[PDB]
Amino acid sequence: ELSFGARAELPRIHPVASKLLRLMQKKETNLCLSADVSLARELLQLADALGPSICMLKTHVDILNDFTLDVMKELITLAKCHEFLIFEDRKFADIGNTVKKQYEGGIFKIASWADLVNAHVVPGSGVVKGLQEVGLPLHRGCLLIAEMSSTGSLATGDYTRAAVRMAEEHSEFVVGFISGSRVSMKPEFLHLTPGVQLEAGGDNLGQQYNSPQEVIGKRGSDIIIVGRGIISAADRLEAAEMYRKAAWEAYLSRLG
């Protein structure tokens, strides 16, 4: 098993994955903050304070009450300053012809500011083809949703295998997965795992939690995605540091 720094140099590595893996090793962080807030001021204050602790900031641009492309300009300034990627968790899931417009255009112009986006594989490979026609020219990457954290997820068995095949057949653009575990045996592919908290539990709408030690250490994922475990805490900086140290040590102990 290679370190993040060595994976950053693999011959078939995507440039976006390489950039991410380099800053993960430099900063000793495999934490992605899920910045699930409705106010631009809170998003930017979290990005600035937690920037040093995170490899990635995950957005849902469509829950931000005061979105403007200028807010995303300020977010890019912080991403460059503190060295993290921006991941818009848009979960594209339409025919190729539709998703290309949803990615490039409308009010959000996601491709103009998002290093990474993600897509569901249920529509077939056209979803990836459509996205890549915008994303390849704009030097972007994509994650495929191979497994989900929620109760009753149908992303199991042959579905997960189809996501892995689709990623591997589109390595020019697909840099990894949303998954609960290592699903690809190819080390060029990032595994990002949501549904993470230090304590056992869930929410009232089907979210299920596992610990950083379980998903990084036992299940072999690379990056934890954490929302409420940080966002709902009083001291979001110390919460982020707890999650960072947990995920980083789990990673180191799997390396041996």
CA angle 47, 51, 55 (to 5 degrees): 115
Q: Which does 212 bind (CB under 5 to 8 A by kind): ligand OMP, a copy of itself, none?
A: none
Residue 207 near residue 198, CB atoms below 8 Å: no
Residue 136 near residue 170, CB atoms below 8 Å: no
Q: Which of 19, 91, 109, 129 is catalytic?
A: 91
What does the buried/exposed string (b/e) look like for 189-211 if buried means 16 or more CB atoms within 10 Å of the residue's CB? bbbbbbbbbeeeeeeeeebbbbb
Closer residue to a copy of itself (CB): 126 or 187: 126
Q: Check whether 94 is labelled as a binding-site residue.
A: yes
The verdict on 89 binding ligand OMP (CB under 6 A) reads: yes
Q: Check whether 91 is labelled as a binding-site residue.
A: yes
In the residue annotation, 89 being an active-site residue is answered as yes
Q: Which does 129 bind (CB under 5 to 8 A by kind): ligand OMP, a copy of itself, none?
A: a copy of itself
By CB under 8 A, the residues from 90 to 149 that bind a copy of itself are 91, 93-98, 100-102, 105-108, 120-127, 129-130, 133, 145, 148-149
Q: Which of 89, 100, 115, 222 is catalytic?
A: 89
Count residues binding ligand OMP (CB under 6 A).
21
Report the distance separating Cα 15 and Cα 18, nearest Å.
5
| Contact with ligand OMP (CB under 6 A) among 29, 149, 184, 221 | 149
Q: Which does 107 bind (CB under 5 to 8 A by kind): ligand OMP, a copy of itself, none?
A: a copy of itself
Cβ neighbours around 215 below 10 Å, total:
29
Report the distance separating Cα 140 and Cα 148, nearest Å.
23
